[PDB]
Design a binder for this molecule. Structure first.
Ligand SMILES: CCCCCCCCCCCCCC(=O)SCCNC(=O)CCNC(=O)[C@H](O)C(C)(C)COP(=O)(O)OP(=O)(O)OC[C@H]1O[C@@H](n2cnc3c(N)ncnc32)[C@H](O)[C@@H]1OP(=O)(O)O
Ligand SMILES: Cc1nn(C)c(C)c1CCOc1cccnc1-c1cccc(N2CCNCC2)c1
Ligand SMILES: [Cl-]
Ligand SMILES: [Cl-]
Ligand SMILES: [Cl-]
Ligand SMILES: [Cl-]
Length: 385
């Protein structure tokens, strides 16, 4: 609770507030020549391991570590269960670096007991585009918790990123760290109502029977945008144009290349869904969501919470409410239990009328080595995985 590590880093202190025009690094004029060239030292018995996520053996070790040891909610009901495919997809975006996928092994057993990763991305923050590392999947094995391994993982990936002449990073966390640039509550639209109530994800309102809740939280009968279809390769430049134009209104967003659109949006069953309303090669509307199940801890009636997470949604032919109603239906049609979304972009406006419930927490957006004013989450135009 006292931030002994984080207050040594170029991030804001917890009570810092910055003026409305500053937009620049905390530590500027960095020189690659000054970056530590060797890996940070580890205690005897532990070693760094650069992972090849395209290799089945390495990927399996990452998958096993995260499945057993990655993020849990604050009541330890759920643990994220990113698929091995999702991990491959998330980590091998265009121009990724294998040397930014770094683990720590326990030498005696040759097992992976720590991990952190980054991928490169261009991030526009308050109208300035900066090449950044997007950091994700920080994880320490449960048996090695509270041994200060996380600061070493963070410092080591920072070194590896700095060696590429990159000095800023973006990341999200459900925990409060110094210091969010924005903080977005999450909301959910129940689809498989009885399951969500039985596992403790949702509460049954005291005025409702289970049977009535199932009826009341039914989804729309048919699409508002009836021509929706899965995205195809030929749609990449059209999605690039539609999404790229939409995102320029926000204070924080990724500046996607055509290659990045193809990577992040072309569909992969049970990983990433993108639907488009296309006419004469123009993409008029798009819906996208990704698949991230949570293992339901200690519950033998169900295995996973099969959740869809809102990604990027843009409409020109409907209202935003109609678009997001269609997103919920498309998730339901693909057998998802729940549709989760953040109060970013225009999402907040739809939550009441589309019968979303408010979640039990918020997702914090962070920048490393960047000084600027924080802002309300409606100004956030990026969804991290
Ligand atoms: C220019 C390039 C820069 C690149 C780097 C950019 C920064 C990237 C930052 C990483 C972005 C990650 C994005 C994601 O992946 S967020 C998801 C994080 N992972 C999990 O929640 C999985 C389950 N939990 C664990 O695996 C461990 O509990 C973790 C690994 C979280 C801590 O391990 P452990 O419990 O064994 O603790 P320790 O003794 O080793 O270390 C204690 C220190 O760790 C600080 N801590 C705790 N939780 C987090 C957290 N979620 N982000 C950052 N720091 C965190 C804490 O403040 C303390 O420092 P201080 O309080 O003394 O200051
Ligand atoms: C159903 C469920 N399962 N688990 C394991 C949880 C925590 C939930 C609650 C629902 O949480 C969200 C709902 C919507 C969006 N984001 C989250 C969210 C919340 C906390 C942390 C993360 N991480 C770490 C940072 N990087 C992205 C992923 C994500
Ligand atoms: Cl493979
Ligand atoms: Cl977290
Ligand atoms: Cl009932
Ligand atoms: Cl391009």
């Amino acid at each position: 609770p006292d931030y002994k590590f984080w207050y040594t880093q170029p991030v804001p202190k917890i009570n810092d507030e910055f003026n409305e025009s500053v937009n620049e690094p905390f530590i500027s004029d960095n020189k690659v020549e000054d970056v530590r060239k060797d890996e940070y030292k580890l205690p005897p018995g532990y070693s760094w391991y650069v992972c090849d996520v395209k290799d089945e053996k390495d990927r399996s070790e990452i998958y096993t570590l995260l499945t057993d040891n990655y993020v849990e909610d604050d009541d330890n009901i759920f643990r994220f269960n990113y698929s091995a495919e999702f991990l491959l997809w998330a980590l091998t975006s265009p121009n990724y670096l294998k040397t930014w996928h770094i683990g720590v092994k326990y030498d005696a057993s040759n097992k992976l007991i720590g991990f952190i990763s980054a991928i490169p991305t261009d991030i526009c923050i308050h109208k300035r585009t900066i090449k950044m590392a997007e950091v994700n999947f920080l994880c320490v094995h449960k048996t090695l918790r509270s041994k200060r391994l996380a600061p070493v993982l963070i410092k080591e990936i920072t070194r590896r990123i700095n060696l590429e002449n990159i000095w800023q990073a973006i990341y999200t966390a459900g925990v409060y760290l110094p210091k969010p640039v924005s903080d977005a509550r999450y909301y959910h639209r129940s689809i498989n109502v009885k399951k969500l109530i039985e596992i403790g994800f949702s509460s049954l309102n005291s005025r409702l029977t289970m049977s009535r809740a199932i009826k009341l939280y039914r989804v729309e009968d048919t699409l508002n945008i009836k021509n929706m279809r899965l995205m195809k390769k030929k749609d990449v430049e059209g999605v690039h144009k539609l999404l790229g134009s939409y995102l320029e209104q926000f204070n924080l967003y990724a500046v996607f290349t055509k290659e990045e659109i193809a990577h992040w949006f072309l569909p992969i069953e049970n990983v990433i869904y993108t639907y488009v309303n296309e006419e004469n090669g123009k993409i008029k509307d798009m819906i996208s969501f990704y698949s991230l199940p949570s293992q339901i801890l200690g519950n033998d009636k169900y295995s996973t919470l099969n959740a869809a997470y809102s990604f990027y949604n843009v409409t020109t032919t409907a209202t935003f409410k109609q678009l997001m109603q269609d997103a919920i239906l498309l998730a339901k049609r693909n057998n998802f239990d729940v549709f989760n979304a953040l109060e970013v972009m225009q999402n907040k406006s739809v939550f009441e009328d589309l019968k979303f419930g408010e979640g039990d927490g918020s997702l914090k957006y962070y920048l490393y080595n960047w000084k600027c004013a924080s802002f309300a989450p409606a100004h956030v135009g990026i969804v991290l995985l």
